[PDB]
Amino acid sequence: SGFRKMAFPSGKVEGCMVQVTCGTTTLNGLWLDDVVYCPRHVICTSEDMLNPNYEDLLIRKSNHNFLVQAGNVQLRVIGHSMQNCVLKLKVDTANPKTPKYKFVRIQPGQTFSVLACYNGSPSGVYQCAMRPNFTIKGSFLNGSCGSVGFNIDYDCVSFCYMHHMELPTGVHAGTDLEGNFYGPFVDRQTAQAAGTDTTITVNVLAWLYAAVINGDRWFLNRFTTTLNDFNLVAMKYNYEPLTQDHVDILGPLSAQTGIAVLDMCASLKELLQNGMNGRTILGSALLEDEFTPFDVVRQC
């Protein structure tokens, strides 16, 4: 019993964190096999950030301009290339601690663990979700760039995020490990803002099924709803539309608890209307949206 916001064990990723320095700029890199991946803005000064021409800034760099440190050992850069917004630094040593891994691009609503790092050294691990507005509500200070997001389902680390920037509202933006940003963001100090964020409806429903599995039923009601009526109501509370895909994904949880997906949608509608009236659901006074249907099945 119990339901916690749980991150994947970070050991497999800790053994990949390195420090990357280019001139006065220092950030984190992910060392997998003989390549170190890091945000391309490591080649920029603060002045370069307004309108950087990365191709032009990079052509002026040689391999020895990049200093890569793995623990107390300096790795030798023997090649460099740019792929979208990530810089790939070929090194002369393959990481002996390279786990079984893949690069995966996630969709909004997906969760992942973040291993926050500074100077190539891991500081902490926490659980995140890719928000519908493509930002993540992280905990990142200056120097955290290059920290990564991942999932570890069955011994294989799936890297899904690399941290690049903090937006004005204190939320965070980054790329997949191929260097493509999540969201309409760019690695430029231009006016950028997070779009209006919404609640990940399918995740709130998953969490309500987690609460039922753990013995709580106070929020259930005798009502059901159509999918369209639910969406009309939910959008008024800034909730993401629930699609037929989401209803299908919640099938296993619906079968386990005996509560049909549209019956749980009716409880959610009522919770949005009434609030909790001094009660809690899994130790929370707010509806939690950073647990996916998959995370619920994994934990419960």
Next chain:
Amino acid sequence: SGFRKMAFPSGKVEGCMVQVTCGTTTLNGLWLDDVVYCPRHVICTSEDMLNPNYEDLLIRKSNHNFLVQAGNVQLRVIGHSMQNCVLKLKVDTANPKTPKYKFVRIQPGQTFSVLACYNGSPSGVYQCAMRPNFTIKGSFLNGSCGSVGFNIDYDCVSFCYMHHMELPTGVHAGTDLEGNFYGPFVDRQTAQAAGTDTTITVNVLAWLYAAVINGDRWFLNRFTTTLNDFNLVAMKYNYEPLTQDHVDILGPLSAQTGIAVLDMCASLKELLQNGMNGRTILGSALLEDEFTPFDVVRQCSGVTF
């Protein structure tokens, strides 16, 4: 910016997790140097748990009755002894991945990271606090026994908790690594319950300082309070007493934000007496008490391990 419930990186502990099997019971063990530590109830059947005589159950076991698996390698048990509620299995191989470590007993209010394991394999990591009633609000299923709690101070892992049991309210009880239970719990299947819990006041204050550091100031006010008046209000709302030690520990956070500790106490008093009025603090409608002052400083300064 941002403030998350953050655990310590678990890699140093993952390299110590092993599976321990005694008869039909399988649980987790912590392999440090040539010893595997695990709950002593691994030698019990469900019937034994009703009224176990651990010394008597253990004397009937030989080394080969304990099967210890580290990954896909079977370790050979060459000795066994009991220390309080922890079984120590001497093995013929020292763990090459043994980090610099210590065994520490924590106080209620102190937080730690739990690496939840099943069959000697780490499944997840989360942060939690030792409640004032000595339970932890963990997330553990059958098979999680032997999972450990820890903190990291520089490059040293301080093991502070080993999982043993779940109480009827779904909360958890365990021991330090010397096998001493936190709380008035016993490793026996008998009527046991968590006592009435209280809120960790110093931790709520630390979290309120974290909210101020992150730009959330709506709860600040012009008022201050005495420590004694604050403690009368704390007692009324099932909050732990705030001591002068707690006030001292919050000094650095008070200096950084410019809000005196007793000035933050007046915010907390107002929050307890009036609620949040539809507002949230760091994305929470409840006052969070599972971040110590040290946790707040560490996360807001970027301390690494």
